[PDB]
Amino acid sequence: HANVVVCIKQVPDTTNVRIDRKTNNLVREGVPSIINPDDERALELASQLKEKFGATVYVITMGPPQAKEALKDAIAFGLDEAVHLSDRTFAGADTLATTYTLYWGIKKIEERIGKIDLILTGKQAVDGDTGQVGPGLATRFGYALGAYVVRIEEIDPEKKEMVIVRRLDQGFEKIRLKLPAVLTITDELNKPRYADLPNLIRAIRYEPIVWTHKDLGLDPKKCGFFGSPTRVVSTNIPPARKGGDIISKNEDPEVAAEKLIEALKKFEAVRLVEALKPVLEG
Amino acid sequence: MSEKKIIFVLIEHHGGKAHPVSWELIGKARDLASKLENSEVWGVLLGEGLESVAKEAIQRGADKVLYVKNREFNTYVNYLYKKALVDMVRKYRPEIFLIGATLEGRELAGMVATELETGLTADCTGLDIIPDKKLLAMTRPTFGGNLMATIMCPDHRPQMATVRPGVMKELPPDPERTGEIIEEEYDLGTFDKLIEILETIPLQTQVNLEYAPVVVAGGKGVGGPEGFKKLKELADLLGGEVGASRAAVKAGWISPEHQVGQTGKTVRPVLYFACGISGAIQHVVGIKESEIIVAINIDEKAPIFDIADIGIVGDLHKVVPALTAKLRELLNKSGV
Amino acid sequence: MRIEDKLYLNRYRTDEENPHLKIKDESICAEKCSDRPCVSCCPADVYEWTESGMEVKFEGCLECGTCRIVCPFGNIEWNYPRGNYGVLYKFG
Amino acid sequence: MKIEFDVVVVGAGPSGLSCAYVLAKNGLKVAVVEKGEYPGSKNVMGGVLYVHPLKEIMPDFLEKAANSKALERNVIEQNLWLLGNEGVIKIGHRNVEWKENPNAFTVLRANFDRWFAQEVEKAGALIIPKTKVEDFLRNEKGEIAGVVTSRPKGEIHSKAVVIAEGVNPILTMKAGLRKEDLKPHMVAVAVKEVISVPEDVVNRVFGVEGNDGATIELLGSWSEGMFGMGFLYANRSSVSLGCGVLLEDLRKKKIKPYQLLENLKNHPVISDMLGEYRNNTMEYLAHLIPEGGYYAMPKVYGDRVLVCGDAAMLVNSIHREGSNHAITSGRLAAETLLEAFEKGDFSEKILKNYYLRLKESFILKDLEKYKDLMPTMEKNHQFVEIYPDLANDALKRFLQVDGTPKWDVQKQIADMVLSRRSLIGISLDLLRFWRAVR
Ligand SMILES: Cc1cc2nc3c(=O)[nH]c(=O)nc-3n(C[C@H](O)[C@H](O)[C@H](O)COP(=O)(O)OP(=O)(O)OC[C@H]3O[C@@H](n4cnc5c(N)ncnc54)[C@H](O)[C@@H]3O)c2cc1C
Ligand SMILES: Cc1cc2nc3c(=O)[nH]c(=O)nc-3n(C[C@H](O)[C@H](O)[C@H](O)COP(=O)(O)OP(=O)(O)OC[C@H]3O[C@@H](n4cnc5c(N)ncnc54)[C@H](O)[C@@H]3O)c2cc1C
Numbered sequence A: 001h002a003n004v005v006v007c008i009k010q011v012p013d014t015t016n017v018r019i020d021r022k023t024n025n026l027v028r029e030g031v032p033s034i035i036n037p038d039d040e041r042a043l044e045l046a047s048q049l050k051e052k053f054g055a056t057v058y059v060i061t062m063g064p065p066q067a068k069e070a071l072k073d074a075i076a077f078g079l080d081e082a083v084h085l086s087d088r089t090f091a092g093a094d095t096l097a098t099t100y101t102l103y104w105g106i107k108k109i110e111e112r113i114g115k116i117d118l119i120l121t122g123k124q125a126v127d128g129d130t131g132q133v134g135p136g137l138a139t140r141f142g143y144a145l146g147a148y149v150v151r152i153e154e155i156d157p158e159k160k161e162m163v164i165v166r167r168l169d170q171g172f173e174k175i176r177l178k179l180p181a182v183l184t185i186t187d188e189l190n191k192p193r194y195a196d197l198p199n200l201i202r203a204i205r206y207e208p209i210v211w212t213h214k215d216l217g218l219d220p221k222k223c224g225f226f227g228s229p230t231r232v233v234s235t236n237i238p239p240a241r242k243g244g245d246i247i248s249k250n251e252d253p254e255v256a257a258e259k260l261i262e263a264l265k266k267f268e269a270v271r272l273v274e275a276l277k278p279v280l281e282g
Numbered sequence B: 001m002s003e004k005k006i007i008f009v010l011i012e013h014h015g016g017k018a019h020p021v022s023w024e025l026i027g028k029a030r031d032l033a034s035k036l037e038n039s040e041v042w043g044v045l046l047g048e049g050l051e052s053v054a055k056e057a058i059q060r061g062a063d064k065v066l067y068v069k070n071r072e073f074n075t076y077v078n079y080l081y082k083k084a085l086v087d088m089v090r091k092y093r094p095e096i097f098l099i100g101a102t103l104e105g106r107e108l109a110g111m112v113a114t115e116l117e118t119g120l121t122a123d124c125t126g127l128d129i130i131p132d133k134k135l136l137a138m139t140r141p142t143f144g145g146n147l148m149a150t151i152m153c154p155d156h157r158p159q160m161a162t163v164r165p166g167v168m169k170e171l172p173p174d175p176e177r178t179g180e181i182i183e184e185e186y187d188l189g190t191f192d193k194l195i196e197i198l199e200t201i202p203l204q205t206q207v208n209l210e211y212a213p214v215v216v217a218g219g220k221g222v223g224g225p226e227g228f229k230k231l232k233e234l235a236d237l238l239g240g241e242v243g244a245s246r247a248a249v250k251a252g253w254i255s256p257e258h259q260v261g262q263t264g265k266t267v268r269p270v271l272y273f274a275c276g277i278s279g280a281i282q283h284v285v286g287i288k289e290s291e292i293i294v295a296i297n298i299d300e301k302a303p304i305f306d307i308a309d310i311g312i313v314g315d316l317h318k319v320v321p322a323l324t325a326k327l328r329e330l331l332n333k334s335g336v
Numbered sequence C: 001m002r003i004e005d006k007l008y009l010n011r012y013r014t015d016e017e018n019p020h021l022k023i024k025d026e027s028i029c030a031e032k033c034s035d036r037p038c039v040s041c042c043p044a045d046v047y048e049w050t051e052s053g054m055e056v057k058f059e060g061c062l063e064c065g066t067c068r069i070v071c072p073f074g075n076i077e078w079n080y081p082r083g084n085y086g087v088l089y090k091f092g
Numbered sequence D: 001m002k003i004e005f006d007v008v009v010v011g012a013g014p015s016g017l018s019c020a021y022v023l024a025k026n027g028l029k030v031a032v033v034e035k036g037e038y039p040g041s042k043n044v045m046g047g048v049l050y051v052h053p054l055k056e057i058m059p060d061f062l063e064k065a066a067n068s069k070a071l072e073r074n075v076i077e078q079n080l081w082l083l084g085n086e087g088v089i090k091i092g093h094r095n096v097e098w099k100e101n102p103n104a105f106t107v108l109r110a111n112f113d114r115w116f117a118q119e120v121e122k123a124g125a126l127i128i129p130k131t132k133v134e135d136f137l138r139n140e141k142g143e144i145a146g147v148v149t150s151r152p153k154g155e156i157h158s159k160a161v162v163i164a165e166g167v168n169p170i171l172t173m174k175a176g177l178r179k180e181d182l183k184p185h186m187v188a189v190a191v192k193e194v195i196s197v198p199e200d201v202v203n204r205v206f207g208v209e210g211n212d213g214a215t216i217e218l219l220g221s222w223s224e225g226m227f228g229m230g231f232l233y234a235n236r237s238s239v240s241l242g243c244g245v246l247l248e249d250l251r252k253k254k255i256k257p258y259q260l261l262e263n264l265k266n267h268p269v270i271s272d273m274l275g276e277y278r279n280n281t282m283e284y285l286a287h288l289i290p291e292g293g294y295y296a297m298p299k300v301y302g303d304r305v306l307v308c309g310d311a312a313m314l315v316n317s318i319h320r321e322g323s324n325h326a327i328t329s330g331r332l333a334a335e336t337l338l339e340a341f342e343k344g345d346f347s348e349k350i351l352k353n354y355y356l357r358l359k360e361s362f363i364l365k366d367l368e369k370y371k372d373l374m375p376t377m378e379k380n381h382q383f384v385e386i387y388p389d390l391a392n393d394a395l396k397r398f399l400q401v402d403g404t405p406k407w408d409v410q411k412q413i414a415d416m417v418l419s420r421r422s423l424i425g426i427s428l429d430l431l432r433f434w435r436a437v438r
C-alpha cells in the first residue's frame, strides 16, 4: 500500500469575495471559507487512489483554528486521517515558512505510517495565488515534482513510478515520475465526487490531529513572520479598468471590421498575441 | 561591492528560440538597474547551441550573459535546472532573480527559492525599487486579480520575483552594445533521473481557456451553434481558444468546459472578444484580468461597454466572419 | 441586468449539470398562459419568456418557491437544489 | 452498513434545531439533516427572535448567546411607521426593562442557526448539513421508517422523522400530509435586503446605543395598495430592510417583488434616514411566509412522523411570530416523541398528542384568532392604500401653522378624511377589521 498526503488549504470563497468600489476594499466578511478548488481535485484523486490501491491517505493543513472544518470536509471524500498544524507560531507564514512547517508536518506523519509515496497539492490557492508550496515541497523531501497535472495514466504501485500529463505553455507532456513524488493538481484532472453519507457522517464526528510547534520539533521562529523572508507591506485593490469607446457602430456592416484592426494596433498588448505579428511587424 | 549587486534574469528558451518574456524582463531589469545603485543586468541561460540567442539577450539589454552549458538543459526538466540554478546563485551571489511567469517559470522558481531559503513572489506586475534600502517592491495580483498586494523582501538574498509575461515592455534589439558571455560548462555526474519526459501533446488537443492568448467568446447573440463556428474561425486564426457564456452553455451550444465567468473559468488572455455578450457582472468577473476587451453586440446600452476597450455596435454574423475574412488576407501577405 | 447586480451579492454554489427548475410542458407557457406569473413574480428574474421558449436562469434561484406556487397550471417541476448547492445565505 | 438513529429531524431551522435540542438533552440519538452548507444557509428572517420560546428550550440561553454573534442588538423599541407621500407617522414603544430582561433580539439567521447548531451539537445531536432529503424509506407496513437523501449511500434509519423543513412543503407531501400544494393565498413573498450601515448610523437613525435595537414596521403606499408589511431592523453593524406581500396580491399586480423593496428604499423618509447607506446592500434574500394558517395547515402528525414550524404553517405573520411558533413547535414535537420512546409506540395513537399540545399551547390559538385576517385585508385594499396617506396629511395639517384658526384645521381634516372615503366607509372599516382581530 502507498502513503498519500494531501496538503489542502482553507481558502475564502472567492466567487463571492468581490470588489466594493465605494469602500475600495474586498468585502470578504461573512464569506465562508472552503477547500481550495484546486485541492478538491487533489482530494478526489486521493480517494480514487484509495479505492483502487488501498493507499492510506492523510490530509494536512497549516492554518488558523477555523481551518479544522476544511480538514473535516476532506474526510468526507473517504480519507483516513486529517492533521492540523494549528499554532499562531505559524501565523503570517509565507511559502518558505509554510513549506518548512509542512515538511516537518509530513515528517511527523512519516513517523506514523511510513515514507510518503505521493504528496498531492493543488495548482494554486486563490488567496495569494502563488502556487509555490507544491514546488517548494518537492525540494524539501527531494521528490520528483510533477506540477500542473491534467491526467493520470499508469500509477504503477509495483514499480513505484507513475505517468502524469503535465500542462506547460508549449503543450502537455507525459512524464514518467518516480515515486516518491509531489504532484500538483489542476482543475482539469477530474470532477470531485458527491460524497456519500457514511463518509460525510464520519466527517462530522471526526477530530483532526492538532499539532503545535512543540509537537513537530521545528525552530520556533523559522515558521511565522520571522521565518518569512518576504513581507506583505501593503494590499490594495486594482483600478476600475478603463472606459472604452464604440470604435464602429450599427451602420457600418463591415467597415467596422477594419476599424477594429485600426484600433487594435494602438494597444501595446497585440505584440503578445503570437499570431498578429504579420499585421504589426509586417 | 558593485558586482555583488548583480541582478539576474532567466531566459526561457523553447528548443532554439527564447520566450518573449526573457527580453521583457531584461528590459525591465534595465529600469531596475537604473534605480539600483551600482548594478548590472545579467542573463542566465541553460543549454548547448544557444549562442544565437545569448547574443540576442545583449542586444535586448543584458549587460552580461551567464550561458550555462549542458546537453541535458535544452529540454525542460525542473529537477536538472534547479541543480544548476542554485550553483549559479551560490557562486555569483545575485541580488534580484527574475523569471517569467510561464508554467515552467513558476514551477522552477518555487524549487529554486527553497534551496536558497529566500523569498519569492509569483506572477508580479509591479516591480519597482524603493530608495531607502534599495529593495524591490514586487506588486502582484492576489485573489484572482482583486488585490494588488505589494510584497518586499528586506534581507534575504536574492529577492527572487516571478513576473507575469506581458506586463513589462521590451527594449529594441541594439547591436551597438556588447557584453561578456560567461560559459560555465556544467557537470551533473550521477544524477538519479526522476522526471522522464515521454511525449509532448499539443496544447489545442484540449480546452485551455486560461493559458490561451486570445479568448473569443459569445452567448445569446451567437444565435444557435452555427455562429460558434464563426467564432472558432477567429479562434484558430489568432491562435486562441473559443469561450462561452452561461447563456450559451445552458442553451447547449458549446460544452460547459468553454464557459467563462464566475462559475466557469477566469480567463487571462491579452485579447478578449466579448462577441455578443451582454457583460453581466458574473461574466465580466472572469475577463477583467485581461488586457484588451473587444465587445461586439447590437445593443449600445449594454454593460459590456463599461469594461470594453474596443466597442462595436453591430450584428455578430456580419462582423466576426467579416473580421476573420479581413484577417486572413493580412496574415498571408506577410507569411510568404 | 438590474437584479443580477444584486444577485451578485449573494453566495452560490451552482449545480449547472442539475437544473432544479424544469418546466414540465413548454406549450402551456405559450398558449395556455396569459400573463406569465412566473416571470412577473420571480424575485431573482430567473424566468424570461422569449419567443424561443422560456429561458430559465436557474443559477440565480433564491429557492423561495414562488414560481411553483404562482404558476396556475402546475407545469414547473420545482425542486430544491442538492445539498451544499444553490443559495448559501451569509448572515441570512 | 445501516445508519441507525432514533429521530431524524429534517431541517435545521428554528423548529428543526429546537426539536433536536430537547431530544439530544434527553439522551436520544437524534440526527438533523440540513440541505444547506451550514444551518442557517437557506434560512431567511428579518430578525426579531423572541427569547421566551428559547428560554424554554435552553434556560441559560442569554448567557450562551451573549459572547457569540448569534443574537444582535436587543430589541428595546418596537415602532410602527405609516409612510405617506412625504411624511411618516411613527408609533413606537420603547421599554427600558427590555434592556435587562430582554423580550426579543434582532438576528441574522445564518449567524443564529449556525450558533444554534453548535449548541445542538454540544447537546449530543449529529447535525448533517449539505444533505437534502428526497423521500422517506418505508417498511412493509407502509409507514415512514427513515430518510433517503440525495447522497449516494444515503439512507438514514430512524424510529421517527420530524419534517421541520419550513415552507415549500415538498417533503410534507411525500409523507401523505398536505394533500395539495400551497395555493398562492396561503403564502406571502417576502423580499429582504441586508444593508451594511456602519454601527453608528444604526445608533443614530434608530435612536439607540450599544447593542440595543429597534424594529420598524413599515406600512404605506410603497406596496402599491396591497397589504405589505415591510420591516427595517437594527443589526449590529447592519440594517436588514425587507418587505413581504401576499402572493395573490402580487400575482394580480405583476410588479416584480423586489420593486416593493425599491419603493421602500426610495421612500423620502427611508432615504432620509439611510442617506447614501442604502446602496451598500450586502445581501439580497427572498422567501415565503405561511399565511393561510388554520385553514391551510396539514395533518401535523402521522405514523412515525411529526411536522413542525412553517411546514405545519404555524406563523403569526401579523405579529411577526413565526420563529416564536417554530421553536415552540419543536419543543412540543420533541416532548411528544419523548413520550413515544418510553412507550415504544410511534403511530397516530401516541403521536396525536403533538396535535393536542399544539392547540393547548399558544400556537393554534394564535392561528384561530387571525384565521380570517388576510381574506379580510384582501376585501378592502384601503388600510394601506388611502389610510396611511390620509393619516399623514391629517397630522401634517394638524401641525402646520399657517394662520388658520384651528377650527378651519379641525374641519380641513374632516374635509380630508371625508373626501377620500365616506364616513360610512370609515366607521365601517374600524369594526370590519375588528372581526379580523377578534
Ligand atoms: C495578499 C497576499 C499576498 C501574498 N503573497 C505571497 C507571496 O508573494 N509569496 C509568498 O510566499 N507568500 C505570499 N503570501 C502568503 C502565502 O499565501 C502563505 O505563505 C501560504 O503558506 C502559501 O499559500 P499560497 O497562496 O502561496 O498557496 P499555494 O502555495 O499556491 O497553494 C498550493 C497548494 O499548496 C497547499 N497549501 C497551500 N497553503 C497550505 C497550507 N497553509 N497548509 C497546507 N497546505 C497548503 C495546497 O494543496 C494548495 O492547493 C501572501 C498572502 C497574502 C494575503
Ligand atoms: C451564481 C451565478 C453564476 C454565474 N456564472 C456565470 C459564469 O460563470 N459565466 C457566465 O457567462 N454567466 C454566468 N452567470 C450568468 C450571468 O449573470 C448572466 O446572466 C449571463 O452571463 C448572461 O449571458 P449573456 O450575456 O450571454 O446573455 P444575454 O444577457 O442575453 O446577452 C445577449 C446580448 O447579445 C446581444 N445580441 C443579441 N443579438 C445579437 C446579435 N445578432 N449579434 C450580436 N449581439 C447580439 C444583445 O443585445 C445582448 O447584449 C451566472 C449567474 C449566477 C446567478
Ligand SMILES: Cc1cc2nc3c(=O)[nH]c(=O)nc-3n(C[C@H](O)[C@H](O)[C@H](O)COP(=O)(O)OP(=O)(O)OC[C@H]3O[C@@H](n4cnc5c(N)ncnc54)[C@H](O)[C@@H]3O)c2cc1C
Pocket (backbone or CB within 6 Å): C080, D010, D011, D012, D013, D014, D015, D016, D033, D034, D035, D036, D039, D040, D041, D042, D043, D044, D045, D046, D047, D048, D049, D050, D131, D132, D133, D134, D164, D165, D166, D167, D171, D190, D191, D192, D242, D244, D287, D288, D289, D308, D309, D310, D311, D314, D315, D320, D321, D322, D323, D324, D325, D326
Ligand atoms: C422576511 C421574513 C421575515 C421574518 N421575520 C420574522 C420575525 O421577525 N419574527 C418571527 O418570529 N418570524 C419571522 N419570520 C418567520 C420565520 O422565518 C419562520 O416562520 C420560521 O423561522 C421558520 O422555521 P423553520 O424551522 O420552519 O425553518 P425554515 O428556515 O423555514 O426551514 C428549516 C430548514 O429546513 C431545511 N430544509 C428544507 N427542505 C429540506 C429538505 N428537503 N431536506 C433537508 N433540509 C431541508 C432548510 O434548509 C431550512 O434551513 C420571517 C420570515 C420571513 C420570510
Ligand SMILES: CC(C)=CCC/C(C)=C\CC/C(C)=C/CC/C(C)=C/CC/C(C)=C/CC/C(C)=C/CC/C(C)=C\CC1=C(C)C(=O)c2ccccc2C1=O
Pocket (backbone or CB within 6 Å): D078, D079, D080, D091, D092, D093, D217, D318, D319, D320, D437
Ligand atoms: C392616552 C392613550 C389612549 C394614547 C393612545 C396611544 C395608542 C396609539 C397606543 C396605546 C393605547 C392602547 C391602550 C390601545 C390598546 C390596543 C393596542 C395594543 C392596539 C395595537 C395596534 C397598534 C396601535 C400598536 C402600536 C404600534 C407599535 C407598538 C406596533 C409594533 C410593531 C409590530 C410588533 C406589531 C404589528 C401589528 C400591526 C402593524 C397592526 O396593524 C395590528 C393591527 C391589529 C392587531 C395587531 C396588529 C399588529 O400586531
Ligand code: SF4
Pocket (backbone or CB within 6 Å): C023, C028, C029, C030, C033, C034, C036, C037, C038, C039, C070, C071, C072, C073, C074, C075, C076
Ligand atoms: S406559469 Fe406555468 S404556464 Fe404560465 S408561464 Fe410560468 S410555467 Fe408556463
Ligand code: SF4
Pocket (backbone or CB within 6 Å): C021, C041, C042, C043, C044, C045, C046, C047, C060, C061, C062, C063, C064, C065, C066, C067, C068, D286
Ligand atoms: S424559486 Fe424563488 S427564485 Fe428560484 S425561481 Fe422560483 S421564484 Fe424565482
